[model samples]
Target: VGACVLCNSQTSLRCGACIRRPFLCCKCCYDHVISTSHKLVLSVNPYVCNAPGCDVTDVTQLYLGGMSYYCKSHKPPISFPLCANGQVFGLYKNTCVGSDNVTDFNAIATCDWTNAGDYILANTCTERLKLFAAETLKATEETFKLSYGIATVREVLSDRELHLSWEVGKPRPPLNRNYVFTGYRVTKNSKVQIGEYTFEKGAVVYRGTTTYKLNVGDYFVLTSHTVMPLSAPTLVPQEHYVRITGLYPTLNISDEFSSNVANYQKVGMQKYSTLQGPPGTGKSHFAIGLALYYPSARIVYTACSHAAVDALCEKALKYLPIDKCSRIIPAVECFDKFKVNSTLEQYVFCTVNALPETTADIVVFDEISMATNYDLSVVNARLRAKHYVYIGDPAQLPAPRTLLTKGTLEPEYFNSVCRLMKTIGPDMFLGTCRRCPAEIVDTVSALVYDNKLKAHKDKSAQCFKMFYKGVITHDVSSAINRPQIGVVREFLTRNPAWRKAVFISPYNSQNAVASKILGLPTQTVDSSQGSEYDYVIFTQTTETAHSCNVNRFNVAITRAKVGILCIMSDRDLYDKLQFTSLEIP
Candidate 1:
């Protein structure tokens, strides 16, 4: 092939434009030019815009006045062939002619040109052509890039390579960091001051004077300003050996915890020890300390009831060395069968039935007042131990109802244990109470026990905070007393910011009063008695019959955490009896 005249290509065939621009070239040269242009433009396709700024490779966007046409800018005046019966446009650089708009390049000539549907007539012809070409080129480039990137990523992530995935990076979550909050301990060196009783680390300040000799278990809530998170308290292990003088005994703790050898000798000589007090005395803590001290000593711990045993177990299990304590291990044994072999230096909480046929060194009972004499016989039959320590307040015996048999004929089991403990002599008494005011404890004790023995009359008396403002008492003989109920309800209704409380009663009748007056569900001993409440309204329904029940009265009095309101008929049978000022008239 020879070079064509128009397109300057080495081809015998002339270009399509030679026919239209015949005056500029011969037929043979024109044919050669067309053939050369065909090879160049056809090879281009939509792939040539591979460079950064040349993404729109296809010359699909061209405009003619207000219309659109598809044409190659590189090609010359190649109008639609008349024999083909179609109208075609020409592209010179970026412009097109023939169709109404650049987007209507494929439209037939008869197609509507003036309508808005003809985007070419809407004057968006050039703009739409450019947009379409740009979008198509951009989409094609993005698709190629994404496909290539995915393949490369898959190859790099294969097991033979880095082998990384979410599964490989993940591990079992760190063993639950959650801790069971048992209770809080007042850190040592606390500046404790309660009312008139003020105590620091080494000395205690009494009514305007300071005393160098302070007693153990003698505590005061800090009244004066003091720092928090103070140093560890001066551990006074020696105070365990002292006798009570006044409310507390002068503490005599060594710098170090007492040795097991010394404690064993003391236990051997004493053989029998007594921990006597009203409730709230630190008997459970003391028992746990003893157990910790004699880790190798076989110690049998019993309580007045199963609950007391539970309390002891709760405290002791916490104090036990985590590694040595078998209760902490998965497969568990109960507290009753707990044994420590002095010979083997091993501790285990097996059931009583599972205890080794051997003997124990120490026997401790927490609620001795609740154990029956028959229960003692069963323990004696099983125990091969010598030393005994009992933790309980004889006056605070188990509830009569719990021990009392359903049958009218059976005697109470608690009474038998009370008799047994009475036979033993020279009991220990714990007078110090960490919670209530001395007066409150005294008043309650005086009422419960017939003894006139005064409680520790220290000045840290804050229990009356509940009674600072007098409590409201509502009485309703019938629902017509609904006005009084409304008054009480109005007082009780508080913003969401306020805490909720409920009224409780032992008798079903009082429960009815609580429900009607408070418009709240009533809580009884079985459901809510042991729980705490901000306020309480107890109904005086001791007995459905004529007589009063002391047992029922005891149940109602103890439920209030802060305040108590007794709702009863003025002429009720309780008036026949006498009560202290603590009881509302």
Candidate 2:
């Protein structure tokens, strides 16, 4: 119609290739162009052309060639890169100028491209940690409530500044979980602002305007309408205290430590608390005595694993006389057990995501190193006690899969527990051991920490209970399982009186061997499940798992009052030396 190109009578379309670089007409075009190119070659006798265009002077150009069809058109498809500004735009063809297209501003990378364990934390800085409790967690709620009271709404005037300071008793919010503000609507004809966000209660809404609504049971503290400016204030430094109140029976010189501890308590001098020692050392007995000193104060108690929980619980049970049994409450602020209908103010062992809304007189963390960093943070945050005590041997073990060692501190990389403790102050440690045989102690001290104890060493021939023992060198390729089995069999056959010996392993294969082959019960060390075994087997799974030295040591050594048998393929892999004091390594 406009500028159509002339073609032969039989020709359908013009060839763009011929226009660019002319070749033959019918025969050659049909043979090479149509047949070889991207087009159907119509079979026709060239001598009988149906008189097409008579001499076939004009042929429409057909885009039949190696060149892409895209080159024929001036406009191209649009694409876009990750835009920096809030708006989304498109790049025309290969250029930047183009019509705007619909696009998502905040596009998250698909899980296929992202690491599984990596988290997109909203605000990880310490200043923004207050909102961290917003996520559903049990212990962290307790920590929050103890540190800050249960959130109550306070209505202040628009653009008005208000300073808030309230006096509270020991924080003991009974709720086990943290509370969330569902939807807030400020009453009509009013305005409010909390922190940096401002909200107004009205029908007419603008871009910057915010609407707030409140639900059924929310409580509000109203301040008359006024202009309030949010203030950035520093947190007050508070001393976390641990109060020990009880009695104990004298065994060896343990009573000396007890007297010294009491003297320190009287002078308000700080000292590290101890939980595990020799069989007759009365670690549990000492803990109870110290706890009973404060009857009116709230307390929180935790253990390394379920087994440790049960063991400490069993030991604590002995201190409960019929009259004092009411005071001995075991609070488990489990996440699943929380109910919104219940009042948190009534429970003594209430759980929370942050600190309890009340302050506790004393808090005790037993086998402290067994909990993961996240779990420990939740637990520490919800403690509402006056005195906080962490009772565990760091040299023995650390958290699972983390570079944490028991009884040791690494300021460079702080875990959640260390971070929380750092928010308070430096953690104190207790040194001096009244546990283990003098000979075993010397061996452990030298081999583990590379420190020498001043205690007298009884290296008499009696100390050599077994030949080819005490740090024997062996290759990693050796049959560790077979040798371990042989050792167990020999111990059982020779020491018939020790029928209750426990076998420990760091691998499921080894655990299975100890259970299925050697005929021993197997159990894994974890926290939530409330059960304890006479003896425990641990496997170092990886380098990170090796941090759980104190936990493993406590599980093995505490189970046996008479003796303990350890089987490890490569002791060199373990960096912490908690067992050095237990034997001559």
Candidate 3:
């Protein structure tokens, strides 16, 4: 051979069929056979499996001689069902798992990405099957983490008991304020978990003398479901991807969602449906009605938060006689936290930490948006229910921590069950604002819902308009910590006529400082999600503008039924608020 056609070297191999008749070495010929359609006349195949290494399945991709073939070792796609946050349900190392960083505690939990799922299949089924397998394991493996924190040994009380300084492992407070949490000492590989310890309320840090012998400089944790179980429900992002793409089949959308079809009983009674509960639309009232209509369906209504569950249960009593309605809490400590008392009977209150074992004809998840991706995974995997119903104001708050809704997750699994079901399943939209005055509704709707909500300005609504159109942005010195406190202490001193008034801040330090100055503790914006005050006085809390997060501000101003006053340092903060329904006036 004068010259190699392809490699232009002195090698003998060449593509006899290609017009160029390229000469190739063993390495070049392997790629040559597959790269072009030209007939490759060769006694051997130089091209190895393009992926020289093996995949998760370890299907040894051996070198094979063939034109239209893979390197004998099979390399399959390794994908898993995931939350938009690029997270998957994983194992608890040294006894810790979950997506929460516990930012306040300065502890960001690290997960073992490799040792995640309990099962793995090779070329099993389609992508849906793969997802089902991944998500199914995700649900079963998910252990609710009320607190995934570390505690250090300060005093070695005894071989079995150590007076440890709990540096971590506490959920955001006011929620867990009065809680008496019980969890095991997270003794890692070296040590073992023999029993559980009681962590009293406010004593989260000082876990007095406790059990488990892990000497100094070692790690420990306090995880949920250790002493008892907690039952909560959330929304569907993966459900949207699977059903819309026909991965998971769903019930057909009956023309049952006609405008205000709620007025009639044509309740198509589809397998699944969602209702849009815009602020002040009386979503609980409407949701309770839907449950009653499915009447005696052994309904089990749930929410991600206890407050949400309690509110729905309270409203459920108004519509149904005690026999048809009730709630099953996780533990007595949990019951002690959310004390259920009204014209209530006894059976209405029950307990069951193991929810999947419990059965219900209909399961309703209220305030669906507030639930995290994992929260829904827990229900979808374990909870036994014939049908599920969800209601949410998707525009308000989405699942916590994760910026889910679009694009973060796989393109296909971007939307939620409530968002997608409207197109493919039975759903309804409630747009009237029964909470705010017409004027305030006009303001909120224009800013958040494109002026879609309906309301009116009465003498009652006027009381909330103390400063502006139900809002106030008081200018203060450009600074953080203690600066805004002056505006609050003085403002509340003058406006003593108000009954339900509280301070809110985006930063926790400000929340702490404001709490110390005023007799009452200042609530964080995140904790203030499901709450509404007669008047909400919010602090910017930062010297620089906090226009970075629009959703935080969106939730911040919307919490007041009467009037909302804000303390801001920068004017750009107002510019950021401009993008929302909040006007300067």
Candidate 3: 10-residue stretch with minimal lDDT: 104-113
lDDT of 3 by residue, 323-347 (tens): 5444555432333322343213222
RMSD of 2: 26.2
| Ranking 1 against 2 by lDDT, winner | 1
lDDT of 1 by residue, 210-229 (tens): 32233233332212111111
- Each model's TM-score? 0.39, 0.42, 0.54
Candidate 1 at 426: error in angstroms?
6.8
| Candidate 2 segments exceeding 4 Å error | 1-257, 260-283, 302-313, 320-357, 402-435, 447-480, 494-498, 520-560, 565-568, 571-585
Q: Give me the overall lDDT of model 2.
A: 0.33
Which candidate number maximizes lDDT?
3
RMSD of each: 36.4, 26.2, 16.0
In candidate 1, where is summed lDDT lowest over 10 consecutive residues?
Answer: 174-183
lDDT of 2 at 266: 38
